[model samples]
Target: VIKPDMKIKLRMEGAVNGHPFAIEGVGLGKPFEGKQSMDLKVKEGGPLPFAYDILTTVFNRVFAKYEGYSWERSMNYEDGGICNATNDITLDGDCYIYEIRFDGVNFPANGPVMQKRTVKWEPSTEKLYVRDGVLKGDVNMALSLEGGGHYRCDFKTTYKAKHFVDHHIEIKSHDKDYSNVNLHEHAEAHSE
Candidate 1:
């Protein structure tokens, strides 16, 4: 039983290549139905080299899987312990991505070399919504390659049961940083 007035404000805090990074945004949704949809406004801070490309490329790859479909997984973030303030909702699985072409030209092209990847979600909040008559929580996600090297993201989301017209976007960066830019787009309404 997803709540109809559910909304979330998410923030990312971490570093890449010795440079601090952050991304914050608000996403509102109607989660009462079987599959909910949300509209998000995310702002990226700073001109960290490879920031946009890294974010977009990974995001696009993920979007392809859950965009038009309802992907569901077990909700087990406690790791078999007492209920705590923070829990992890992980999607522990493997998927294939392309490697390089296998040809001395087009001699042996067209075959897809497979790679391995995984994604996980962990949210630290108490706001819970109804999904199929059951209460649900919001969580953050991390996408990673086969090896230990991976991109980890955490979120402190605030969910509400209200609406407003005004939206806010904040910008911050280190001294001598690149131009702060907003990555705003009209995404097909979806949910977390």
Candidate 2:
């Protein structure tokens, strides 16, 4: 017949602000909406040939898919490290800021030619531990030597993330057609 002991009587008592939404007076909370994206661009000052192709092919990797002939050597010069495997750096699929500067610093004409000169490239783009998406952090070779032409090259790159995104995704048949064009889904619709 007596009221139940109010929420365990304690040594301390206090009042909290309850002058707000209570499931009846327009209940409220936080609202999260929208997707995030990041884009990294190298705006000028790149090498004669960027790491674009070299990386896709696994740099200095000459062999069959099965296995064989793998040379991974490391060399150091001017506080820099280079290797036959180069370096593995993975970035977000969106970041594509590619610009680098190459200084035409050649050998002293008769500085004794050393065919196939190699150097380690460590570019300055580390969005890895910091935001939207990760960027290839340690790409050691920012420049390349013609080997056939000039003997030396210095690469300088800059990150100009003017902004980001434009992934226009569309649907299509899983399998492809011989015409290729026919598989592009026209007003007539694609057919297997």
Candidate 3:
């Protein structure tokens, strides 16, 4: 049963200065609804946060004030087991501001020492949001990264929940209405 809170998936595609990115996965409801706590079983290394980190870093490097909107290792880091802390940001409109800091959350599978950081430009202008609803979408990747030992991906995505889509124009609504939506109908599962 897809509980009222267990129904979330987001697929985002866009780029920093045409860098291009495609990321999609199950949306683990709000910041603390389901498995967002420091729970090793829930918050540890997965695809969602992992993908977002890649997206942020790829583009963050292109900005003039990149340092202001970038993520790096926290000096107080010592948890090991892929322990990398970052300033996950909600992009804004100005291209150099962020609305909030998505505190440090960790994933425990990517590696015994995995880490990805991000620094956003603007919050009110870049952070994506929805109108108290859920949404789903697809993103086609254009480019990718290299030399990241803890990362492995083809960079393709398909969103399946309601999310706040942002295009730097008007805050739109991509409501979550996938209770009857079937992914197998049009999705190719990854071979693990």
Candidate 4:
């Protein structure tokens, strides 16, 4: 019964970084301070080890694709910040920007290499309709080659963004312990 008009489609299996936040001034009529609790926290960057485990050793030992195991986010974030689903860009008039470069190879999830963190992530959403540059849905990936001796290193990445809110579709994720953490359903849409 998840019908806000009912249209949900997310086939991701972890590996999410499409994070953006909103609830700014409420719809045009304004004067509504509702639903304001967000998540996705990784504040100071301490015990780090997720940029797709260093892009699976630079795509399984440097640009191999090795069946290109995992990656999702086909479309949905139409703006706030956090997108690395890879490609399928659209967004210009209302606002949109696209660019995702990755070369991260720093590894140690198991231990055997060590050092490297090139994570250049960009953000922009809230506008679409053949606007192929605003980034939307489908981003999921997890590749591990045999496992063990896991330490590694490599680097490179770039991202750009713009603003526009038409159809409204947002997806933000960077693991902040669900930063702000707030989810409440059925305020009854309001009925005085």
Candidate 5:
């Protein structure tokens, strides 16, 4: 069992857009058995093609599964209609926003954009945590691309603290299907 004072570390390995992506992070939480304060620091491996397009979905999935967070986004229109258009609005959510600006000073042809979304979570006993010497759970989340496309992914993870781990992610969409995908990550914990 993992005590509240312990520092839990996590790693991730998976394919996004038919390319490999990986990330690792550590969660620092204050010593409290209930309603604890926590901060996460994550590092992504470099040179992965389509990093932004993929990492957004991956992070959303990870956060939703491990932290009980969910997010979605849509363009606000002047006339109650759904179309491929732009909405200049403020970003609001219970999620931490990570914005990526390409080409530094020069704005792209499409102009500026914010990586914003709406987040939600329902009360559930099924959440990620060390239980009975194993961490096991499943998560489902959707990703809304800036241009267009709502991609879906379902992930299952099983790991032992400071030991082996396994992941299975299935990405689904109307245009493409990435099924039975396999990946792995290792977990570590420090005594406090």
Candidate 6:
């Protein structure tokens, strides 16, 4: 039985520019009677202030007033735990670019080259809102995941109750060109 004024905790754990980040909504406010929203401000005492600071600070630094193409290679960050090769590309504001494209070993002539994709940053609203009766809604941040940890992935999940909950962290990171090979070959590698 879902009760009103129910405290909710949502968290995301990951890294940014090699810096680890863990932001959480300790417990969002009570539900209202419709849609509810809250900001995950990096202000003092805020639920994710510390982590947010780390992410934005290092994240922006990683970009550092940039432009044009910049790239790097990362292997075994998470998922696809296996031997993989990956690349990065920066544009229109460096790390804060436009979109991310992925190319992998499963390409043409010698192997299989039928599956691949490009994900565009779907602008963002650094807040989470829930809906229903007294719509107990509260979530924050919209961070997007990358493909280098293994083979790049557009990550997302859902929380439910009645019409459930919707969430997304708007992280339009090195959302541009990227390369990775042999990602679909396994499920775990190691940068561990």
- Which candidate wins on lDDT? 5
Q: How does candidate 5 fare on TM-score? A: 0.29
lDDT of 3 by residue, 5-99 (tens): 32233333433222333434332222122121010111222233332332331212111111233343321112322222233333322222222
lDDT (C-alpha) at residue 118 in model 4: 26
User: How many clashing residue pairs are found in candidate 2?
Assistant: 19
Sum up the clashes in candidate 6: 17
lDDT string, candidate 6, 1-192, tens digits: 222333322233443323233333222222332212222222222232111211221110111010323222222212231112212323221112212222122122221111222122222221223445321212222223234222222222122321222222232222121111010000111121
Q: Model 1: residues >4 Å from true position, as ranges?
A: 32-45, 51-192
Whole-model lDDT for model 3 versus the true structure?
0.24
lDDT tens per residue, model 1, 83-157: 112212122122111111100111112111011132222212223356564434344334343455444433222
Best to worst by TM-score, what's the order?
A: 5, 1, 6, 3, 4, 2
Q: Lowest-lDDT window of 10 residues in candidate 2?
A: 20-29
Local error of candidate 2 at residue 145 (angstroms): 11
**Residue 147 displacement (Å), model 3:** 18
Whole-model lDDT values for every prediction: 0.27, 0.19, 0.24, 0.23, 0.29, 0.23
Ranked by TM-score, the better of candidates 1 and 6 is 1
Any runs in candidate 5 off by more than 4 Å, and if so which?
A: 10-24, 30-45, 52-136, 158-192
- Per-residue lDDT of 48-140 in model 2, one digit per residue for the tens? 121221121121110001111112222222223221232222222322111111111222223321222322222222121223432221222
TM-score of 1: 0.27
Q: Which parts of model 2 are misplaced by more than 4 Å? A: 1-101, 106-137, 141-157, 163-192
Clashes of 4: 46
What TM-score goes with each of the models? 0.27, 0.17, 0.20, 0.19, 0.29, 0.23
**Candidate 6 has what TM-score?**
0.23
